[PDB]
Amino acid sequence: MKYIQTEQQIEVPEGVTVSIKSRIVKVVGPRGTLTKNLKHIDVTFTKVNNQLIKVAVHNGGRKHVAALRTVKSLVDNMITGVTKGYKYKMRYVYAHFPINVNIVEKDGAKFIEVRNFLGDKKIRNVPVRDGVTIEFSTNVKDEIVLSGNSVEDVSQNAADLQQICRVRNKDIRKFLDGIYVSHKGFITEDL
Template sequence: MKYIQTEQSISIPEGVTVAIKARVIKVTGPRGTLVKNLKHIDVTFTKVDKNLIKVTVHNGDRKHVAALRTVKSLVDNLITGVTKGYKYKMRYVYAHFPINVNVVEKEGQKFIEIRNFLGDKKVRLVPVRKGVTIEFSTTVKDEMVLSGNSVEDVSQNAADVQQICRVRNKDIRKFLDGIYVSAKGNIVEDL
């Protein structure tokens, strides 16, 4: 079944500007600028006024209309990123061998260096994505905080760290060691 016309509306808060040219969205806010390329999704953007954008699909089938909500969520995430930012907290879990985590710089790029995971001599390196900052908590033991404007970069960096610390060739019900996301939120907390 074809849907003749389906719309979603995106409201833009004060202090944020959204520029759309050929389905490349550039969102500028108090925390910086984010750019997202949506040329692969066939939708129409209409700027109603400076505080409202309508996203429309003409003659779309069910999956094409479902992509409309995805586009709305992606733009909402960009707006949240430039106003509040994103913060992921990760905790180190170990039973015996304490995990050592540092941020090192090699050949001009930053890496998260993980040592002594399950007593391994192997040093695990995870590249830090552009725009992501890593801090180690001073109040909570064995906690790392990843923060940045782009939810995709911050969450992917957290996923990379968690994936590189998977336990292999052992019973994962017994060996629960690893680095896991303990909390997700915004840098600028709502009052």
């Protein structure tokens, strides 16, 4: 029924200055700098004080208002991702064949290379996205760890690998072989 004004706060922390002209957003914190293009969403940002920003929708419909929060959230994860950072934890599972995962390169590359999945002679290669680093985690068995500033770039490089490992032609309950996302969290600790 056309809501005349509804808004959302975007909080800003001590090490971060976010700069939005047109709807292009830049966020620069301690961990790096990220940029994301909101031109498609039709909302008004407002600075208030250096730690606070509002996003508003005037005379919106449901679908329009419903995209307000997902703008707030989308910038937040740029803010936390530039302060704390994002770390996605994955842990292999196989019931017979030991899935064997390395990091490989051709022409600057950085691919994730999965061998012997369910005994496959086939070699799966997921590429490493930019701004995301993969470190096989010492002290825990069959763990890969993807870290970076961009949630969407890590969580995607996460699910990219989990999906190279899908199983065909077998009951996929009884055959659980794969690489799955075991934990989602930040980089900086105590949090």
